[PDB]
Amino acid sequence: STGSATTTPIDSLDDAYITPVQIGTPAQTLNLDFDTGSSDLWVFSSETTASEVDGQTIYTPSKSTTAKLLSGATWSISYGDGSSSSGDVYTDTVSVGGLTVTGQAVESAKKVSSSFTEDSTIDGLLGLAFSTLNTVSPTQQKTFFDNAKASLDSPVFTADLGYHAPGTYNFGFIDTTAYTGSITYTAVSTKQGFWEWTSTGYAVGSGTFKSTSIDGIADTGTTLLYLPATVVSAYWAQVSGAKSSSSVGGYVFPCSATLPSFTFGVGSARIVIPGDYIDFGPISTGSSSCFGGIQSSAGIGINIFGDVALKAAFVVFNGATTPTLGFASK
Numbered sequence: 001s002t003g004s005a006t007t008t009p010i011d012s013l014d015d016a017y018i019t020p021v022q023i024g025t026p027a028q029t030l031n032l033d034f035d036t037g038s039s040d041l042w043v044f045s046s047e048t049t050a051s052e053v054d055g056q057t058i059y060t061p062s063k064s065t066t067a068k069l070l071s072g073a074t075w076s077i078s079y080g081d082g083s084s085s086s087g088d089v090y091t092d093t094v095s096v097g098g099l100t101v102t103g104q105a106v107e108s109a110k111k112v113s114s115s116f117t118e119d120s121t122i123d124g125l126l127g128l129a130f131s132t133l134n135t136v137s138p139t140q141q142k143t144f145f146d147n148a149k150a151s152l153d154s155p156v157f158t159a160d161l162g163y164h165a166p167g168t169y170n171f172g173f174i175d176t177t178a179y180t181g182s183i184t185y186t187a188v189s190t191k192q193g194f195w196e197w198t199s200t201g202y203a204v205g206s207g208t209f210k211s212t213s214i215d216g217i218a219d220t221g222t223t224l225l226y227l228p229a230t231v232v233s234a235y236w237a238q239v240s241g242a243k244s245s246s247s248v249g250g251y252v253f254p255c256s257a258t259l260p261s262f263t264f265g266v267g268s269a270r271i272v273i274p275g276d277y278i279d280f281g282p283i284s285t286g287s288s289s290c291f292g293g294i295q296s297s298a299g300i301g302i303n304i305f306g307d308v309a310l311k312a313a314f315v316v317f318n319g320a321t322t323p324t325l326g327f328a329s330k
Contacts, residue, residue, distance in 0.1 A: 001151045002172035003099025007034065007161065010121040013280055014307060015223050017161060018121060019169055022095040023106055024064030030057050030123035034169055035221030036159070036195055036317065037304075039133035039143050040077050041094070042085055042107035043124035044116075052112050055120030059108065066102075067092045075107045075135045080222070080300065085112040089136055094144060096126075099171050101148050105134075105141035125221065128157065128317065133193035145171070145319060155319045159220055160330070161311035163277055179314035179328035184269035188323045192302075194219070195317060197325050199305075200267060202227075204235050205260030209270070216303030218315060218325055224280070225262070225273070226297035226304040235262055235294050242292065248283050251292035255282060262294060264309060266327040273312040 007017040018031035023043065030043055044053060046060040061067035067090045076086035087110035094104040109124070116122065127134070131142045149155045152172030160178050161167040168178070189196045194217040201211040214227065232251065236242040238260050242253035253259070259275030278293035293308040316326030 001099055001148070002153055002170070003095075003097035003148075004168060004170045005097030006166050007169055008166045009162065009164065010119070012164070014161075014164060014311065016122060017167070017220070017307070018123075019096070019126070021126060023059050024061070024092050025066040026064075027095070028057075028059055028064065030059060031121065032124045032126040033122050033221060034126045034128055034159075035219070036128040037217060037219035037221045038077065038079065038125060039127040039129045039131055039193065040075060040107050040135055041105065041124070041126045041144055042075065042077070042087070042109055044112070045087070045108040047087060048109045049111055052117045054117050057123045059106065059124075061090045061092065061106075061108065064092055067106075070105060070136075070139075070141075073105075073136050073139060073141075075137070077135045080304075081115070083113045083115040085109045085116060087111065089141070096144065096171065097169065099148055099152075101144055104144055104147055105136060107136065128220070129195065130190050130193045132190070148172075149319055157317050157319070159310055159315045159317065161220065161307055163274075163311050167311070174316060179330045181329055183314070183316055183326040183328040184266045185316070185318070185324045185326045186266055188325055190323060194302075195323070195325055200265030202231055202265065203263040203270075204238050205275075207238075209263065209265065211265070214264075214303055216297075216305050218310060218317070219304050219306050220310060222304045222306030223293075223308070224304075224306050225294045225308040226300055226306065227294060228303065229296045229298045232294055232296045235260070236292065244296075248289070248291070250295040252283060252289045253292055255288045255290040257290075264305070269327065271309070271313045271327055271329060273309060277308055277312060
């Protein structure tokens with residue numbers, strides 16, 4: 001089997017992408033944030049505290065003839081941005097782009113943190129990291145991909161995120177028309193539960209490539225590119241007037257600037273992030289200070305190849321017995 005679904009930016013900055021997901025019988029379609037940095041499929045629901053729902057579409061398990069309470073199971077998750085959610089668990093039929101999994105754990109939120117409530121466009125998350133990170137207790141549950149894997153034509157999914165435009169998540173096949181050149185594959189460590197890999201270096205604009213190992217994670221659920229402070233300083237030094245602002249929370253730059261590209265290495269291959277992809281717009285409405293799309297990871301503990309980096313590539317998440325990542329230009 002295969003599946004293919006379009007993923008759509010939630011706003012004009014590409015802050016996140018939403019993908020329609022069919023849950024239950026008859027289908028209830030929710031727009032979920034596909035997140036290769038986490039491993040829970042959770043949804044706003046009829047059980048979510050009413051004051052914490054503000055415009056989201058909810059899953060109502062009592063209206064699904066295939067929903068079953070997973071007795072005794074609870075979940076609770078906290079994300080790298082400080083947001084969180086928790087609740088109970090149903091199993092139900094879940095379909096993405098024509099690919100159907102029966103008995104998928106659907107984690108129904110009883111509580112969500114304010115950042116979720118305040119974003120009416122995201123109805124929940126669909127985790128695509130390794131199932132070892134799934135938070136369901138006392139019986140850990142599998143991700144949608146883990147459940148589908150054995151049925152897929154090939155045990156892979158691909159992320160093809162658009163810049164200021166829709167893109168595609170495919171399951172079970174590589175669309176050889178969706179990229180240019182060849183796909184370069186690189187080793188993955190699953191020891192932290194992530195799609196963790198080592199970039200071979202970077203360049204700023206037309207500058208020389210610096211060969212240096214940068215361990216980080218491929219994370220579709222993170223907006224920005226978070227890299228070591230040395231790398232980030234080298235980038236922003238090429239933008240007149242850019243500076244790190246403790247009060248804003250990162251590097252800002254004059255909105256009048258033209259940003260240089262940023263290249264990262266995948267083995268001997270190179271992925272070029274155009275400068276425009278690094279502009280996240282005014283820090284507040286009407287400001288002439290703009291927020292940068294490359295930020296320091298120093299306070300995180302891990303480097304994160306988020307959407308800024310991934311949307312410059314066609315990315316293969318190869319879930320074979322020994323997982324690997326592939327990157328191609330497009």
